[PDB]
Amino acid sequence: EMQLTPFLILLRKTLEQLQEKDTGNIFSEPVPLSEVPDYLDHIKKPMDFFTMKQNLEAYRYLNFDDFEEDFNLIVSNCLKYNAKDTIFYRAAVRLREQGGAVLRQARRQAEKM
Numbered sequence: 001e002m003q004l005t006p007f008l009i010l011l012r013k014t015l016e017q018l019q020e021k022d023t024g025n026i027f028s029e030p031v032p033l034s035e036v037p038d039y040l041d042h043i044k045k046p047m048d049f050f051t052m053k054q055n056l057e058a059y060r061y062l063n064f065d066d067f068e069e070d071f072n073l074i075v076s077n078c079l080k081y082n083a084k085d086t087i088f089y090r091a092a093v094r095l096r097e098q099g100g101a102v103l104r105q106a107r108r109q110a111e112k113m
């Protein structure tokens with residue numbers, strides 16, 4: 001029960017804050033299927049920040065949970081695909097930690113709307 005425009009502004013700002021935590025930009029764009037040809041074997045829904053931005057502007061995120069769900073997918077896909085001893089796996093762990101703090105603060109702002 002709130003106005004749509006300020007909520008989308010908040011999601012845009014939050015998405016920028018999450019991208020800032022992915023310093024290697026490893027989650028900025030879809031995992032390249034031509035470079036990882038087996039990626040889709042067990043990853044049923046790829047996700048990345050560029051796709052999240054598209055979904056946001058298409059009015060596909062109308063509550064915080066739907067936004068946070070796709071962020072969690074970025075993290076979970078990376079934990080699932082990559083072995084524990086890789087930079088990619090540890091990057092997803094760090095993103096989960098740093099991104100969760102960004103998300104808690106952003107949701108507190110949404111609840112004030």
Ligand SMILES: CN1C(=O)CNc2ccccc21
Nearest residue numbers: 026031032036078081082088
């Ligand atoms: C597996 N993977 C990822 O999980 C994240 N991004 C990426 C870029 C290039 C090759 C592989 C990946």
